[PDB]
Structures are given as structure tokens and as C-alpha cells.
């Protein structure tokens, strides 16, 4: 009757703090628990060994926090595993867990994006763990030429550096031009290699910027007006630009570019602005295909050369990747769970984007046949569509279309998905549904987690609590219990959102009982919640002086920097001309959270085909003493 269960992340990382939650449901008294982690399969060393007690005051639920040292015992190469062994009294529950070699994260920041032969590249390597907290480890750095050959190795230490490692590499005078790379990796994890590029080239600053901006972010193939483009030229110090611009158009097909010589135009740049139209006739005449439908799927690129009236500076700029499309939108189901609970409300996270991939704001979407279920995309281009599922085992097929008014039906975007029934233990029709209002969540608020139960009433009184777990950045952030009274179908969990939930977290909750043929049954459900991407703390740089005072060459200025107490701030001032030449590989905050999310162990928006699939797909391994456990995971990478 008593059931001991352990949950551990799908993949365990080295030198990272990992939590393990221990439960002894339907038990009395104190239960001594000793958790030991051994290597697989030899068990030569005891990587961890902690102890705890499950008391009735804690509802027989505890956790074990352990950090596995990066021992010299682990061996491309074969994948490594560990044996997790939890001992409750007499009973022992073991699970074989996959191990990732990633020690944490390395971020490289170069002062500039492009460099002249002879100059020095100043770069900082930030060394953190999976919690983004500064650590002191040994890092291997490789300088790599455009050809690919490493030309300078080094092994330094991050200790006593507050997670910031200042380095430099001198560029020889005689050097090969092109895209160079810096490759760093932790000493303990030579398989996790982080990279940043910087171009090496002979150049001079253009002293001004040219902006090629199309009216629309795309080109409708049946628009007789053609592609109207506005040219905006301005000096690097703000003032507008007077001059002449040579604009020419081209059609891009994959990697094959075909210039359109007939579309070449010379226009005056007056007051820093000019306009030039590519006529549809010239476009069709330029390509040797009368059938305009074939141009759909291809893109357009525009090249503009602006010359000042003084004739002392010239800037060429380009805007490529302008898709020739037949619809202003594009529907994706990459954020909607692919499993539903028959009879319970099914939530869809429609992701409507512009042809260039950017989110689309205020776009009407609806389900075919259900005009009542018509929602509007938010600022992130994500809309929520709640439907009512009928209790059935039929595959739920959904087709979502855009209902943007003032847009014809031929140009409306459409996409079709399918969801499968959540198979239950012994066809008992016991389902759990966690629902959350889909809206940009920010640190410092509170989210109401609605636990909704559906099962027969013959065993509904036995369910007295739910076990909920939170997954953030690939590690167990928080676990607890939710008391539920007999008769209540819906209970509300006030979950306090702090800074530890950035950028997103998964909430997987489950309940257990003894039902049907006296069988031990587990029913689970998970949901993915996004949070407003931002810094954990804050860092703002603003003017530390009067804004009547104008900056003058050489003049002292006061810089107001406001951030977290004790934090080490590293600075860099870059001329905007550099970014006019190359604006790639620039370190932003959005890119940091991007890397974190790509090292996530979850692979689905939510739920699964069974109670084990919910844990496995949400990056968790459940293993009970009675035998109910999740299947093994032998894949570091998610399934395609």
C-alpha cells in the first residue's frame, strides 16, 4: 500500500546543483531516506550520498540537494550514465539517468564586430553555471582562422575574477581576411564548445548610415504598385544627409542571385530621404517566366549606393530577404501541446508570424467551424484558443485560419494540426488538467494555477493532495503539495513568481491513488508558461548630468550607472560606424536567454500520451517502488 517515488531531471549535469524530491504516499511515521548516486555500471565511486527524513509534518515529502563533482573517472566517446539509488526503510528504488557533459555556459563578448590587420581584439569570457551564477573554473580557448585551423591555444582560470575573464589577441599585419572564430570550452567538458566570430578586413568608417526600408516587410505577388522603398541617409552624429542614391533590385532564389538591370534608378536624396519604386512590369519582364506564381517562395534584395554632393564619402547598403508571398501571415503550432484530455477544455497556443519570421500583432485567428472561438494575437504574436473537447478517443484534428478583416480569403494563412487522446491507466478515464491564462507573465506577480480533476466519483474522495513540480533552466526549481478536499473539482494554487522563473518554467502536477482492480495509478499533466524575458536584477546606463549640456570632443562627462549592489560591471564604447559595416555577433540579453532555452531538457509544450510521457516530455524521470516508472532516456538531443 505505501508507495515510494523519486523524481530526477531527465538528464543530470556535472558541477551543477540538482534536486531530488522524495515522496512516501500512504505512509505513517518517520521514513529514513538515504540517496546515493553511483556511476554506471561499475559503481566504482559514490558520487553523492545524502540523508533526510520524511515526517508527517512535511506530508512525507522532502528533497535532496547534491552537486556531482566532475571526477576524472568519466570517459565524442560513449554516453555516460549514473545509477540513482534511493533507500526508504527496507525498500530501494533505483533509476539509471543520462548525463550531459555541459558544465555550464560560456559567453564571449568582443569589443567590436570587425577588425583591421594590426589591431588588438579585446574580448571577455563570462563563466557561469546552469544558474547563470559566476563560477571559477579552467577554460580552454582556441583562436581559429577563416580556413578552420586553430592558431593559438591557452588554458586560463576564472577564479577570483567574479565570473569575468579579460583576454586579448593581437592580429598580425600580414593576415588572411574573412570570418575568424574564438572557440572556448570548459576544461571539464571538452564537448561543449562555445563560439563567437569577428570579421577581419581592410576598411575605413563610412561616417554616415544608409537605411533601405521597404514599405511592407514583404511583397505581395499580385501588387501592381510594386515594391516601394524609402532611402534614409543620416550622418553618424544625427544630422540629415543631402546627396544622390543609385538603387538597383534583384531576385534571390536560395543562393542564386539574379540582378535586374532594367530596374536600376538614380534618385535624389533630399532632406535625408528618397523614394524609388520597382514596377511590377519590370519585375515580370526581368525574370524569364511569365507565370508570376513561380516567384512565390523567392525573395527580393535591394542595393542602394549613396554619394554625398561633396563626393568625399560613399556608402553601399543592402536589404535582402524580402519574401515574395501570397499571404501576410504564417501559422505555427510549435507552442501548442499535441495531447488532449477527452471532455476537458483543450488550449491552443497559435503562433502567427510575418513572412520574415517576426511576431505579428493584433491578428484575428479562429478555428474552422467554430466562429465563436475567435481570438486575437498578443504582442508576442501568440493567441490563445480554448475549445471544448468531447469525451472520445477520436484524433482531434484542428485547422486554424487567420480572420484578419479587410484581407481577402485567398491571402489568409492556414495551418492544420492533430492531437492525440491522453491514454489512461486501464481505461479508467481519470484525467488531470492544469490550465493557466496565456499572457505575458512578469517577475513579482502571482499566477493562479487551476487544478481541475475529472474521474469517476467512486474514488474521488481518496485524492487529498496534488504534487506539483517546477522546471526552470533545466533543473528542479520548486516542489510542493496542494491540499484538495473531497468534492472539490477545481482548486486554486497561488504561485508566487519571482526572478528565478526567467525565462520560462514548466509546471507538471500529478496525483496518485489505488483504484480499479486495486492497481496503483498515477495521472499527470504538464504546462509550459513563458515569462517576460529580462535580467534577473537590473543594469541601466544613463546620463549622469544635465541634458542642456552637450557632449563635446574631449569634454568630461558624468555617466550614471545604476545596478545591483556589489556587481562587477564591464563597459565598452563603440563607434556606430562599426555597426554600419557589421552588426552581427553582438552580445544582447535576448541571445543569452536563447542559449539557455536551447539547452533545455523539455521537448514538448505540455502533457503526453500517458503518465510517463508527461514526465519524460517535461524533462523528468519518475520511478516508484511499486514499479510505475518512466521509460529510459538515451538521447541528449530532443527527438525530431
Amino acid at each position: 500500500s505505501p508507495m515510494y517515488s523519486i523524481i530526477t531531471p531527465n538528464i543530470l549535469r556535472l558541477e551543477s546543483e540538482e534536486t531530488m524530491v522524495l515522496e512516501a504516499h500512504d505512509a505513517q511515521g518517520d521514513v529514513p531516506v538515504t540517496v546515493t548516486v553511483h556511476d554506471f555500471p561499475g559503481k566504482k565511486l559514490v558520487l553523492s550520498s545524502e540523508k533526510t527524513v520524511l515526517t508527517p509534518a512535511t506530508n512525507h515529502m522532502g528533497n535532496v540537494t547534491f552537486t556531482i563533482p566532475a571526477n576524472r573517472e568519466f570517459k565524442k566517446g560513449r554516453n555516460k550514465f549514473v545509477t540513482v539509488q534511493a533507500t526508504f526503510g527496507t525498500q530501494v528504488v533505483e533509476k539509471v539517468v543520462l548525463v550531459s557533459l555541459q558544465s555550464g555556459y560560456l559567453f564571449i563578448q568582443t569589443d567590436k564586430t570587425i577588425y583591421t590587420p594590426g589591431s588588438t581584439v579585446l574580448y571577455r569570457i563570462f563563466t557561469v553555471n546552469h544558474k547563470l551564477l559566476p563560477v571559477g573554473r579552467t577554460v580552454m580557448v582556441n583562436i581559429e582562422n577563416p580556413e578552420g585551423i586553430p592558431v593559438k591555444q591557452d588554458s586560463l582560470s576564472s577564479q577570483n575574477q567574479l565570473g569575468v575573464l579579460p583576454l586579448s589577441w593581437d592580429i598580425p599585419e600580414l593576415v588572411n581576411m574573412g570570418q575568424w572564430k574564438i572557440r572556448a570550452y570548459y576544461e571539464n567538458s571538452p564537448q561543449q564548445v562555445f563560439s563567437t566570430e569577428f570579421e577581419v578586413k581592410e576598411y575605413v568608417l563610412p561616417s554616415f548610415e544608409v537605411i533601405v526600408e521597404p514599405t511592407e516587410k514583404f511583397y505581395y505577388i499580385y501588387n501592381e504598385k510594386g515594391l516601394e522603398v524609402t532611402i534614409t541617409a543620416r550622418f553618424l552624429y544625427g544630422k540629415k544627409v543631402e546627396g544622390t542614391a543609385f538603387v538597383i533590385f534583384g531576385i534571390q532564389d536560395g543562393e542564386q542571385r539574379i540582378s535586374l538591370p532594367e530596374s536600376l534608378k538614380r534618385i535624389p536624396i533630399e532632406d535625408g530621404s528618397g523614394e524609388v519604386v520597382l514596377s511590377r512590369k519590370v519585375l515580370l519582364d526581368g525574370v524569364q517566366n511569365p507565370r508570376a506564381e513561380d516567384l512565390v517562395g523567392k525573395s527580393l534584395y535591394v542595393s542602394a549606393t549613396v554619394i554625398l554632393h561633396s563626393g568625399s564619402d560613399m556608402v553601399q547598403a543592402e536589404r535582402s530577404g524580402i519574401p515574395i508571398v501570397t499571404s501576410p501571415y504564417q501559422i505555427h503550432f510549435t507552442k501548442t501541446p499535441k495531447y488532449f484530455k477527452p471532455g476537458m477544455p483543450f488550449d491552443l497556443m497559435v503562433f502567427v508570424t510575418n513572412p520574415d519570421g517576426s511576431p505579428a500583432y493584433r491578428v484575428p485567428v479562429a478555428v474552422q467551424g467554430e466562429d465563436t472561438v475567435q481570438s486575437l494575437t498578443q504582442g508576442d504574436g501568440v493567441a490563445k484558443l480554448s475549445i471544448n473537447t468531447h469525451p472520445s478517443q477520436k484524433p482531434l484534428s484542428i485547422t486554424v485560419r487567420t480572420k484578419k478583416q479587410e484581407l481577402s480569403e485567398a491571402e489568409q494563412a492556414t495551418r492544420t494540426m492533430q492531437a492525440l487522446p491522453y491514454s489512461t491507466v486501464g481505461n479508467s478515464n481519470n484525467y488531470l488538467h492544469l490550465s493557466v491564462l496565456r499572457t505575458e507573465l512578469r517577475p513579482g506577480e502571482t499566477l493562479n494555477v487551476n487544478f481541475l480533476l475529472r474521474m469517476d466519483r467512486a474514488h474521488e474522495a481518496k485524492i487529498r493532495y496534488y504534487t506539483y513540480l517546477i522546471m526552470n533552466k533545466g533543473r528542479l526549481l520548486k516542489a510542493g503539495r496542494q491540499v484538495r478536499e473531497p468534492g472539490q473539482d477545481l482548486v486554486v494554487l497561488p504561485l508566487s513568481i519571482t526572478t528565478d522563473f526567467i525565462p520560462s518554467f514548466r509546471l507538471v502536477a500529478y496525483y496518485t491513488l489505488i483504484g480499479a482492480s486495486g492497481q496503483r495509478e498515477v495521472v499527470a499533466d504538464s504546462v509550459w508558461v513563458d515569462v517576460k524575458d529580462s535580467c534577473v536584477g537590473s543594469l541601466v546606463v544613463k546620463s549622469g548630468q544635465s541634458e542642456d549640456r552637450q557632449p563635446v570632443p574631449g569634454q568630461q562627462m558624468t555617466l550614471k550607472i545604476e545596478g545591483d549592489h556589489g556587481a562587477r560591471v564591464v563597459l565598452v564604447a563603440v563607434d556606430k560606424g562599426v555597426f554600419v559595416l557589421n552588426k552581427k555577433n553582438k552580445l544582447t540579453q535576448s541571445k543569452i536567454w536563447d542559449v539557455v532555452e536551447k539547452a533545455d531538457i523539455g521537448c514538448t509544450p505540455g502533457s503526453g500520451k500517458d503518465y510517463a510521457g508527461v514526465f519524460s516530455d517535461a524533462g523528468l524521470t519518475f520511478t516508484s517502488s511499486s514499479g510505475q516508472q518512466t521509460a529510459q532516456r538515451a538521447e541528449l538531443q530532443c527527438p525530431q
Binding site: 582562422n145 585551423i149 586553430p150 592558431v151 593559438k152 591555444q153
Partner: protein, 96 residues
């Protein structure tokens, strides 16, 4: 069974020049043990292969020492070419 015993003997005498032909023939038999009176032939063939993957030697040792030795006295460039940095391009310039 006999060929398995002989392979175990070659792994004890460190005669790694005669081992590859033996092992290749063993793999060509596709004998996976099991069956009526397979006891000896099952134990020995897998014991010998397990011992072959144990005494398995990694890669041919790489350790080059290349010294530019010029008659005039100046600074001396020495080079240690190791396995871990074999691909590292080591450039040395001379103006004359």
C-alpha cells in the same frame, strides 16, 4: 574455443602485430553463444574479445620535437608537437 584461447595468449605476450587477423576472423563467424553445449565456446570467445577491448591501445604516440637550429646566436624557437595540439598551426618567421 581454441582460437579464443590463442587470442588470450597473444594478449598476454603483447604481440599486437598478430591480433588483428585473429579478431577479424572471429567476427566473421557471427557466433553469438548460446545453444546446446555452447558453454565453453560461449565463455571463451566473449572473454577473449572482452580482454581484447581492454588491452586495446588508443592511438600511435605523437610527440614531435622540431628545433630551428641557425648558426647565428639569437633567440631560440623550440617546438613540442603533442597529440592534444597536433592541429595547432605553429608559424615561425625569418626575415632573411
Amino acid at each position: 574455443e581454441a582460437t579464443s584461447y590463442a587470442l588470450l595468449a597473444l594478449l598476454q605476450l603483447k604481440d599486437f602485430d598478430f591480433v588483428p587477423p585473429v579478431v577479424r576472423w572471429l567476427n566473421e563467424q557471427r557466433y553469438y553463444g548460446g545453444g546446446y553445449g555452447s558453454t565453453q565456446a560461449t565463455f571463451m570467445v566473449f572473454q577473449a574479445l572482452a580482454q581484447y577491448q581492454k588491452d586495446a591501445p588508443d592511438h600511435q604516440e605523437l610527440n614531435l620535437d622540431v628545433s630551428l637550429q641557425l648558426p647565428s646566436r639569437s633567440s631560440k624557437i623550440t617546438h613540442r608537437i603533442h597529440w592534444e595540439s597536433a592541429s595547432l598551426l605553429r608559424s615561425e618567421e625569418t626575415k632573411e
